[PDB]
Design a binder for these strands. Structure first.
Lengths: 114, 146, 100, 54, 49, 124
RNA sequence: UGCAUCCGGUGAAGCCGCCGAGUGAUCGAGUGGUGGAGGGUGUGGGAGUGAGAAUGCAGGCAUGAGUAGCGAUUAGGCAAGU
RNA sequence: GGAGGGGAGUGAAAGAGUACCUGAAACCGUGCGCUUACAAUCCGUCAGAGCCCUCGACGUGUCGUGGGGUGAUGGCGUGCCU
């Protein structure tokens, strides 16, 4: 067990698959390494995920009083949030559904020692 | 309850069969028996508790009738017209051990445990084998009477 | 030593102190039933003759009457509508063998 | 054409795992004194100053 | 003393309604009509042969 | 009165889905597909409880045959000799002896070989 | 629902479980968790009383799939800015 | 940047945060245990190795009237409805 701090970005306008694609690069990694990865990652979901990780880090630093050096992304997961529905019109009068998916990106950083 | 082997009960013994003037199916049935473990009272059909079986002088196996020329070992490549047949004499002069192998493999179960049991089968065309360190017991193919 | 005790229309290999589940006996816990045998093995010597065995019994203390596992039957035949649910807990007795 | 049957969870996930991202390999750079991490592709431009290091 | 909770119908006075189409352990899936025909969805007149 | 049937309905669903743990895919997750398998599963269990007696008999026989042929006798003549000697021992315990008391098995083999005739292939 | 009883903010129902029970539908005045306000039992009365199927209806969610496509026949680019 | 969140506070309760009573399932994830990359699987059943957990006992880890989860492997096995 370790001291920890959490963050959640709820109702993010990206899909949970496209969030997981980048989360899987940073799970278990240090916060510094994770933020660098997500900085230099071409995927757009890297930005929200990095915002959340930075938020949890700053929460550990300010609210909980932990050194940002010792921080690891001990847990992180995206959850398929709400899903707005739209109608794309198509050929021959038919109407296909479009799903604007959202995600809840939850991060829990731990201050594991070296 | 009824006995089941547990992780160290499977003892392995090495047997060696001289296949000189011995009938092919006779030998193969005996060897499959030993390889499966039917000769053992610890026999459990979900366990390869059998014994290792060396076969020597496989080239001197005995085949009755015109089987040496009119029994074919067939094989398919997966391709059309990819049926290649080879008689038992052709197979004996090319790859001697293959006839004894194929016989035993057919006499064995066609399953994952059968595959595991094949590994205990060693077949050699001469009278000599390298598995002497294992101290194999000679196994004469008897017939229990009644 | 050990023996092969006949009871419940079946046979059970037992020795003294061995606890065995058998079919229901018309007895009560703490009672000491005496059961016939089919074979006795006092190590090497093997008693197998019927008279020599009928001169022998096996004492066993009834510990408790119990019930076996729940068998759940659901007979089914396709395209008929035939289902038939049924259950079973077989009554059993636990015997601790005490002497042979 | 169309899919005859609902793909099982196992197979769906078996290939959906292949839709991943290769993370970029990073290297250290000492621009403005600080040690930052960039790609080796961008190392030169970072030494120069053509890399927005947020 | 005889209260309202002591009142019971006589034996055999009340037979349970048979409920058809409520499972194959009962008069289910056809309601005793069989498979097909006029008699599977309608009733035939008595004045008809 | 109007009856919301979810309350009575979900019971069989809970039952089936709790019985269908360990199943792959839909068969563990969905009532309609777990139900299909619980039919097959309990049919198979009923069948197999009765075939289990045969399978264990087959196993015991295999082991007895092995031990017997190690004592230089066939299973059939062993059974013949035991029935002639009045040994009511069952194949389960014979197999257990063959595994655990080979000496006692040899003793029973000697008993059976004695009780056999002098020409087993004679009408008598 | 009639009647008679009983439980309940010292935590009802519902839901999730554990431990179990019944020949079966199923049970649990056995237990914990969640939860927050009505329920259980017996005896009768009445039913919008039990769904897995109707190319069933409605909602939600999957599979395909992070796939196709991102809508002409002109073409965008650099610098600077915000 | 905001959205959203974390501390702090209100509240009996924020596992009541204007997306809000309870908050099932499908569905989606994360984590732990077991298993699986020589194998032909109506997907289960019966037997069952090994691993893990648990309850008791003695003695100090092997045994049991045991219970569970996994399942190597073997046998059997042609979905439901109409």
């Amino acid at each position: 067990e370790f001291p920890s701090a959490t963050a959640k970005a709820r109702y993010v306008r990206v899909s949970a698959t496209k969030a997981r694609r980048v989360i899987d690069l940073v799970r278990g990694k240090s916060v510094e390494e994770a933020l660098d990865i997500l900085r230099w990652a071409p995927q757009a979901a890297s930005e929200p995920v990095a915002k959340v990780i930075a938020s949890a880090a700053a929460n550990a630093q300010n609210n909980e009083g932990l050194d940002p050096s010792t921080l690891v992304v001990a847990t992180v997961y995206a959850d398929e949030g709400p899903t707005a529905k739209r109608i794309r019109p198509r050929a021959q009068g038919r109407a296909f559904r479009i799903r604007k998916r959202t995600s809840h990106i939850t991060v829990i950083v731990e201050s594991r020692p070296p | 309850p009824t006995y089941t082997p547990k992780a160290g009960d499977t003892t392995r013994s090495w047997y060696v069969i001289d296949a000189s003037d011995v009938v092919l199916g006779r030998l193969a049935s005996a060897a499959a028996t030993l390889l499966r473990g039917k000769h053992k009272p610890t026999f459990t059909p979900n366990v390869d508790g059998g014994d290792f079986v060396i076969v020597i002088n496989a080239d001197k196996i005995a085949v009755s009738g015109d089987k040496l020329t009119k029994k074919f070992a067939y094989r398919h490549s997966g391709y059309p017209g990819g049926l290649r047949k080879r008689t038992i004499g052709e197979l004996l002069e090319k790859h001697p051990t293959r006839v004894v192998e194929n016989a035993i493999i057919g006499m064995l179960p066609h399953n994952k445990l059968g595959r595991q049991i094949q590994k205990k089968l060693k077949v050699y065309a001469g009278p000599d084998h390298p598995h002497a360190a294992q101290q194999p017991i000679p196994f004469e193919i008897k017939q229990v009477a009644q | 030593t050990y023996a092969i005790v006949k009871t419940g229309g079946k046979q059970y290999k037992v020795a003294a102190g061995d606890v065995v589940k058998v079919e229901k006996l018309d007895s009560e816990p703490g009672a000491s039933v005496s059961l016939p045998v089919a074979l006795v093995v006092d190590g090497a010597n093997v008693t197998s003759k019927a008279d020599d065995l009928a001169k022998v019994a096996v004492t066993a203390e009834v510990l408790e009457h119990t019930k076996g596992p729940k068998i759940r039957i659901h007979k089914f035949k396709n395209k008929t509508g035939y289902h038939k649910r049924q259950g079973h807990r077989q009554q059993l007795t636990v015997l601790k063998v005490t002497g042979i | 054409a169309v899919p005859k049957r609902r793909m099982s969870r196992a197979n769906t996930r078996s290939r959906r795992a292949q839709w991943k991202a290769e993370a970029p390999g990073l290297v250290t750079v000492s621009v403005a004194g600080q040690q930052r991490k960039v790609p080796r592709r961008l190392l030169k431009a970072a030494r120069l100053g053509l890399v927005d290091l947020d | 003393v005889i209260k309202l909770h002591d009142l019971k119908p006589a034996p055999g006075e009340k037979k349970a309604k048979t409920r058809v189409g409520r499972g194959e352990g009962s008069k289910g899936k056809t309601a005793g009509r069989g498979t097909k025909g006029t008699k599977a969805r309608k009733n035939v007149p008595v004045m008809f042969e | 009165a109007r009856v919301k049937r979810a309350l009575n309905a979900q019971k069989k669903r809970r039952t089936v889905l709790k019985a269908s743990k360990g199943y792959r895919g839909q068969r563990s997750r969905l009532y309609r597909k777990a139900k299909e398998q619980q039919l097959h599963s309990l049919t198979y269990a009923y069948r197999d409880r009765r075939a289990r007696k045969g399978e264990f008999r087959k196993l015991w026989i295999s082991r007895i045959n092995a031990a017997a042929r190690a004592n230089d006798i066939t299973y059939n003549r062993l059974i013949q000799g035991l029935k002639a000697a009045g040994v009511e021992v069952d194949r389960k315990n014979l197999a257990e002896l063959a595994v655990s008391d080979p000496a006692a098995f040899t003793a029973l083999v000697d008993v059976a070989r004695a009780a056999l005739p002098e020409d087993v292939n004679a009408p008598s």
